[PDB]
Amino acid sequence: STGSATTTPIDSLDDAYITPVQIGTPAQTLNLDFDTGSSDLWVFSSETTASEVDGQTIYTPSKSTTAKLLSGATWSISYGDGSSSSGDVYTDTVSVGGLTVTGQAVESAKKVSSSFTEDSTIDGLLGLAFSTLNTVSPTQQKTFFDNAKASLDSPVFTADLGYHAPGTYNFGFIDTTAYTGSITYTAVSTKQGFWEWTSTGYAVGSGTFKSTSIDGIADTGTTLLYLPATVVSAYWAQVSGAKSSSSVGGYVFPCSATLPSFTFGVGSARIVIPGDYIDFGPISTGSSSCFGGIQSSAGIGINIFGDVALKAAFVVFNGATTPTLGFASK
Template identity: 25%
Template sequence: MRVATSLPFIVLSTASVGNALSLHRRDAPRVLEAPLERRHLDKPLVKRDPSSLGVSIGNNVWVDPSLRLLKDLEPDKLQRELSYLMNLTLGTPAQTFTLVLDTGSSDTWVVSANSSVQTDDAYNATASSTYKSLHSSYNATYAGGTTALGTYATDTLGLGSATVKDFQFVVVDESSANVGIAGVGYNISTYTASHEGKVYSNLPYALTSSGITASTAYSLFLNSASASTGTILFGGVNKAKYSGELQTLPIVPEYNEYPSLAIALTEITINNGSSTNPTTTNLPLSVSLDSGTTDTLLPEALAYEIYTALNATYVKEVNYAYVDCDQATNTDANVTYSFSGATITVSMSELVLDGTEKGFPEGTCVFGIAPSKPGVNILGDNFLRSAYVVYDLDNNEISLASAKYDSTKDDILEIGTGADAVPGASVVPSAVSSATGNGVQGTVTSEVASVTAVTITTTEISTTTAATGTTSASVTGATSTTSSSSSGMAALPTGNAKHLLSGLAGAGLLLMI
């Protein structure tokens, strides 16, 4: 018996892309817009646990890979099981799938109809006349212990009004997850690329090679915390969805490769309503902009400084802090992230989660920034909702601007080819292009006191030592804004963990070989 996932088909927008797919019209932008639906999944999926860097599954539902299921929580109050879901079709005739959109991984996979996995969203290969098996195994073991076993295949992909023939994806036969993933990261970070040296065109690259988009780039607009929908715009920028100017930053390479979509965080400013507290503790730091992760993971010393300024209390057992729930409406307080001068401000309404934990005082809510493990630094959905983000995979760049929620009209422009391809974007001068925190270069160490709860105060934490541990920062930032094209990973030793960084705490794989 299969359990319904209660995820209705999301109707893809065609009004804004109908002309875009008439490629003979030179004046029509080659873009493809697909709506994202922000939904609760079937069961409460909560509690980020950075000690488990992989997919964690519970109660037959997909769990954000940096989350774990708690037995004694209050599911009616929790929002952390929210994911951003996108519809596409595979096969002839078309079979519809609702998949988790993930900028932190690269493979698209669906559950096989022949699998024992309980899902209504299953792929029936025998029912498709255009299905072809590639006889190439997919055997991913996540650091948290979850496995996904399957086989690469090709079939006809449908996304909105666009069609891609011979699209490569994975048919999963065994997995603890019952909702598939649409990975839109670099194609060199697919399983087969990192393990067999075989690079293929995953979703964003396939749209480009099929002529649907002019460039391998896309824009992400998750909308506000109160909205249930967002959009991903392949090949284009919607100027109506952001304020100010897009500012372009280099993606941080890892050992001269570009396996993940990360940029250098250079400063954080915490405003508690009465004082402003800038900090560069553990910065510059490479941080992944990952739609597959719900919250924010930062080095301990940096997280503790934020807790201090915002009067948050950290609880070791659940690796989260809490604040008074009424802080969600404190419009005077916020956290501003700076990337070599480009800034995004995140309000308390994003950071104070509508949820609690057993043992938290009455009237308190979970605070959506958690201490990370070394090398696992993520700006997830509670950051991304405040930003309009353009991921330019061709040029190894990310452009940022503050999200604009009240626009009722679209202003869509095509992302072209070559340098300066993103329309209306300006390169940030002398931007940091390398930083600690990517891969195994993280330098934060800590020995947390064995107490149930600790309140971090300014007298307990500093940039070098603290009562709860020791931290250090090692800056390798450069001022060069140039970045080379990504290349295949065939020459990389596939057993070296420092290269297995796609997605980390997102839906991406941290593979154990």
């Protein structure tokens, strides 16, 4: 089997991407944030505290003839941005782009933090990291990909995120028309439960390539590119007027400035992030100060190849017995 679904930016800045997901019988379609940095499929629901729901579409398990309470099960998660959610668990039928999993753990939110309430466009998350990170207790649950894997034509999924435009998640096949050149594959460590890999270096604009190992994760659920402070400093030093603002919480720059591209290494191959991808607009309405899309990972404890980086590439998440990551230009 295979599946193919369009993923759409939630706003004009590509702050996140939502993908429609069918849950239950009859189908209840929710728009979920596909997150290769986590491993819980959780949704706004009829069980979510009423005051914490503000415009989201909810899953109502009582209206699904295939929903079954996973008795005794609870879940609770926190994310890198300080947001969180928790609740209980049902199993139900879940379909993405024509690909159907029966008995998928669907984690129903009883509580969500303010960040989630305040974002009306995201109805929940669909985690695509390794199932070892899944927070369901007492019995850890498998991700949608893990459940689908054996049925797929090939045990892979791909992320093809758009810049200020829709893109595609495919399951079970590699669309050879979706990228240019060849796909370069690189080793993955699953030791922290992430799609963790080592970039071979970087360049800023037309500058010479710096060979240096950068360990990080391929994370569709993180908006920006978070790299070591040295790398980030080297980038913004090439932008006139750029500075790191503690009050804002990162690098900002005048929008009159031209942003250089940023290149990262995948083995001997090179992915070029165009400068425009690194512009996240005014820090506040009417401000001449713009927020940068490349920021320091210092104090995150890990480097994150988020959407800014991933949307410059066609990315293969290869879930073979020994997982790997593939990157192509497009």
